[PDB]
Design a protein around this motif. Sequence first.
Motif, short mmCIF file in Angstrom:
data_model
loop_
_atom_site.label_atom_id
_atom_site.label_comp_id
_atom_site.label_asym_id
_atom_site.label_seq_id
_atom_site.Cartn_x
_atom_site.Cartn_y
_atom_site.Cartn_z
N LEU A 98 0.85 -1.18 0.00
CA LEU A 98 0.00 0.00 0.00
C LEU A 98 0.89 1.23 0.00
O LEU A 98 1.85 1.31 0.77
CB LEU A 98 -0.94 0.02 1.21
N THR A 99 0.57 2.19 -0.87
CA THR A 99 1.36 3.40 -0.96
C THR A 99 0.47 4.63 -0.79
O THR A 99 -0.71 4.58 -1.11
CB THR A 99 2.09 3.50 -2.31
N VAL A 107 -1.33 8.26 -1.34
CA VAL A 107 -1.83 8.98 -2.52
C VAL A 107 -0.82 10.06 -2.90
O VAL A 107 -0.22 10.68 -2.01
CB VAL A 107 -3.20 9.59 -2.22
N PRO A 108 -0.56 10.28 -4.19
CA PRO A 108 0.44 11.29 -4.58
C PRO A 108 0.06 12.68 -4.09
O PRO A 108 -1.11 13.03 -3.95
CB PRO A 108 0.44 11.21 -6.11
N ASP A 109 1.10 13.48 -3.83
CA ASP A 109 0.94 14.83 -3.31
C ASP A 109 0.14 15.72 -4.26
O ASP A 109 -0.47 16.70 -3.82
CB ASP A 109 2.32 15.43 -3.07
N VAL A 156 4.72 20.41 -4.31
CA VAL A 156 4.53 18.97 -4.46
C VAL A 156 5.89 18.29 -4.51
O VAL A 156 6.75 18.66 -5.32
CB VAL A 156 3.70 18.66 -5.71
N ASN A 157 6.08 17.29 -3.66
CA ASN A 157 7.28 16.47 -3.70
C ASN A 157 7.22 15.57 -4.93
O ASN A 157 6.45 14.61 -4.96
CB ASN A 157 7.41 15.65 -2.42
N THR A 212 7.16 11.65 -5.11
CA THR A 212 5.92 10.91 -4.90
C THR A 212 5.06 10.86 -6.15
O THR A 212 3.87 10.55 -6.06
CB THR A 212 5.13 11.52 -3.74
N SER A 226 -6.69 7.89 0.46
CA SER A 226 -6.79 6.48 0.83
C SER A 226 -5.50 5.78 0.45
O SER A 226 -4.73 6.27 -0.38
CB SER A 226 -7.99 5.82 0.15
N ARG A 227 -5.28 4.63 1.07
CA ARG A 227 -4.12 3.81 0.75
C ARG A 227 -4.31 3.18 -0.63
O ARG A 227 -5.36 2.59 -0.91
CB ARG A 227 -3.93 2.74 1.81
N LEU A 228 -3.30 3.30 -1.48
CA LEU A 228 -3.37 2.86 -2.86
C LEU A 228 -2.75 1.48 -3.01
O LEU A 228 -1.62 1.26 -2.56
CB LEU A 228 -2.67 3.84 -3.79
N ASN A 229 -3.48 0.56 -3.63
CA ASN A 229 -2.94 -0.74 -3.97
C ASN A 229 -2.33 -0.68 -5.37
O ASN A 229 -2.25 0.38 -6.00
CB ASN A 229 -4.00 -1.83 -3.85
#
Lengths: 33, 50, 21, 149, 376, 49, 124, 146
Positions: free
Chosen positions: B30-31, B33-35, E356-357, E360, H75-78
Amino acid sequence: EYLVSPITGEKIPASKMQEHMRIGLLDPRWLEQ
Amino acid sequence: AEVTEEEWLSIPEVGDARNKRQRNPRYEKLTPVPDSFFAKHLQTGENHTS
Amino acid sequence: LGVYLTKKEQKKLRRQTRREA
Amino acid sequence: PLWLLLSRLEEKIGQLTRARAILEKSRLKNPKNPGLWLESVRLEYRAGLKNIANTLMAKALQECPNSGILWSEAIFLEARPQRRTKSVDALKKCEHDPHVLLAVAKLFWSQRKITKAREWFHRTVKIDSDLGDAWAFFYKFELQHGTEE
Amino acid sequence: AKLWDSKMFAEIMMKIEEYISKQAKASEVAAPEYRVIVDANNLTVEIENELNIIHKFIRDKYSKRFPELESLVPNALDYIRTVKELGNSLDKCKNNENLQQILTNATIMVVSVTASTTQGQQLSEEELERLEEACDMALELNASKHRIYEYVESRMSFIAPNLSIIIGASTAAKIMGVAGGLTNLSKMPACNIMLLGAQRKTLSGFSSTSVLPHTGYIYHSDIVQSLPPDLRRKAARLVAAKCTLAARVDSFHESTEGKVGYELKDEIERKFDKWQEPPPVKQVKPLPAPLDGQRKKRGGRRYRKMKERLGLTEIRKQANRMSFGEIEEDAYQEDLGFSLGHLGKSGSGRVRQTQVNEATKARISKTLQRTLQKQS
Amino acid sequence: NVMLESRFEKMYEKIDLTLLNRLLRLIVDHNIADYMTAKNNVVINYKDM
Amino acid sequence: DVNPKAYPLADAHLTKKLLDLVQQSCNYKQLRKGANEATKTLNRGISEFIVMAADAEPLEIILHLPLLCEDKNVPYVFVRSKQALGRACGVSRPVIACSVTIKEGSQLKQQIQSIQQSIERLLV
Amino acid sequence: TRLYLKAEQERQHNYLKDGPYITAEEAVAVYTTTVHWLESRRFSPIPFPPLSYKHDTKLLILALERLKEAYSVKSRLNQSQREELGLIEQAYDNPHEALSRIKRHLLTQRAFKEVGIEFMDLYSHLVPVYDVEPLEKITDAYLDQY
């Protein structure tokens, strides 16, 4: 017939060449696994 | 009663059709959400003066 | 006559030699 | 000027076996791989085996590639299933002679693709006019499929 | 003209070669039979070419009446039968019992729908009679083709034994006739044999896969059709390759009994059994034991990149900070739980907006890049 | 004054793909109509089914 | 010897050069493997010569290649081992038919003519 | 879900085996009514999106925004979600390449990958939910917007 080995530097029969290449580079970590 | 001993021994073992990727999948990381999503939510609400 | 090991076979041989070293 | 004329005279007056050598008579001294081999192999194998004609066409293309008329005629030696996938694709790869575009338009017309045939005929006219005698075929196709106007 | 010239050619061929074929067929009920097979394989090609000519003429004539049916009905024989049945009178297109056989029920709706909105004017009496005579000639040629194919099926026990062993004589005849004869089929690559007799069926709204594209006699043969649908393209490829091998063997009249044919058929069956083999027993992997203690992990450029990608960012640091006592208006309507926090709100202590980084950034996987290389 | 409120019971499940393709070709490019109706004909999957 | 069908069979001295040139053409993306691809190249008129093995199981599955080579005026020659031809093709599996294809501006052109001359000398 | 999918398989097999359930007369009547309506209103058919379309980029941005609205809530991304977001970001970074791929799919793509199905349980009935490949999702969203 006889063929020179590209993996061992030895002469082998032509009929065993395919198996010779197949098992002459059997990765020993396969045996470990 | 009509099933003979050899026929009883001939019963096969049940296997699984699905492959390694379905039976034992690797952990689904799990990653965050992008900034850019925070940035885009922040862009909204900024209103033109005209 | 001589024989030519294929590209995958060359990769395997090189990888095994590097791992041995 | 008379290499094809001597063969046409020997095919009319005399036997075709002597005409097959008279067509190769001017190709024995110094042919230098001419463009008239398409008018020589078709006239020699006109009654000759199509396979023979096919062998001669294969020899001619191999020795003299990029020949627009030879390639255009080789399209129509090959049977209909192979006229497109192999006979005209690599051909368009090889060259863009006015006879080539005319041959592609003819192939499309034989497949009853009217819009494609008209577009390719217009392209042939635009790229080169008064070349390859494409005007006769264009007129015939327009009369058959296109409107009177 | 061309319709009459084709008629003359068909009559000339049927007078001699078709008569000889019938006599050879009825003989078993210095004049060999191999030459009869050769001239029959020539007749099928000639009939196919002149039938293409007839179909072209019929399509050109009928484009005045119904200019769309050629696209709706791609097959030449089906087009000829449909134009024979329909003709100028398109009013009978409703409840055509005679069209259910010619066309499938999917394209019957399409032709009926299109016929209701066609601008093509009616033909004249001369056009109608010429078209009808052309259709009758086309059906006569089709019947002659069926007869010659029956003769070829009868003779495949003698001309192509191995190929008739691998696949049924019906499919054998249908591929030998369409390929131009045994020699032409043996000089054909194995990839081009599976595509013999592949009608370009028009997808009627449905996807291309439903229409089964690139499918030929081999695919519709008995052995290939005896497979589950998900395993039929592979079967078609294997059967086409083995049939090409058998045809190359037969073109030189080697292995007359069929030793090579059986040596290939049994390995085809072996491959089919291997494909349909039950899956083997695979042990269930137990969940790993709960982990306690310390495990040394390396650090470096990979670890630094992973930490930069996964570590907290300044904007994502401000996201999870909520001012105490300062009630903020709801931002997102669909989710009241969502809140920017100190982001964009007074009290965060940052005069300028957080950037924004770019570490990521979201980008596709490596294997998803491979698909894009196979698409453009 | 009579008011009838109702709903087409199974319109979603009964849209014939060939008829829908024709009706779409009526209003949109035939390439687009073919793409849409082909997209409506795909493999529905769920677990093992 | 072993196969009378191997009319185009090359000798020990020539087969070494054949296999070496096949490997070089493979390194130059100039080689097609298999009887089907050799047939396709012959039909397309892109192959300048065709090699095949003399130990195919039926031997009639590559016997149409000489006929098609005569039809297309392309030299052909046979070798005594499918496994060595496959290895020279860079493929572990045995290959019983390989094709070398025409390329524009290739640097193998001179070796191609040399091998074609030797192949023509072998015939008759 | 299992029972409904079994029933759906039965229904699809019935349709395939028994052919279309709309008789040719009914289809002709429906098509004629639609044709007459379109002729009455003077409706010009929607053309294929031109390569020089004046709004080829605005519609693409609108389509990509809708695809990213599912992720607007943090939310946590799969893996699948981040793959879809990467595809959307790639389309946004190079709008013209994405548009070219979309037009290519509209012209030549007639076969598509399988789409997953789940069922939202409203406790009174089941609402089908369809998961489509993101690569096809972008094309479908642009087509819907256009």
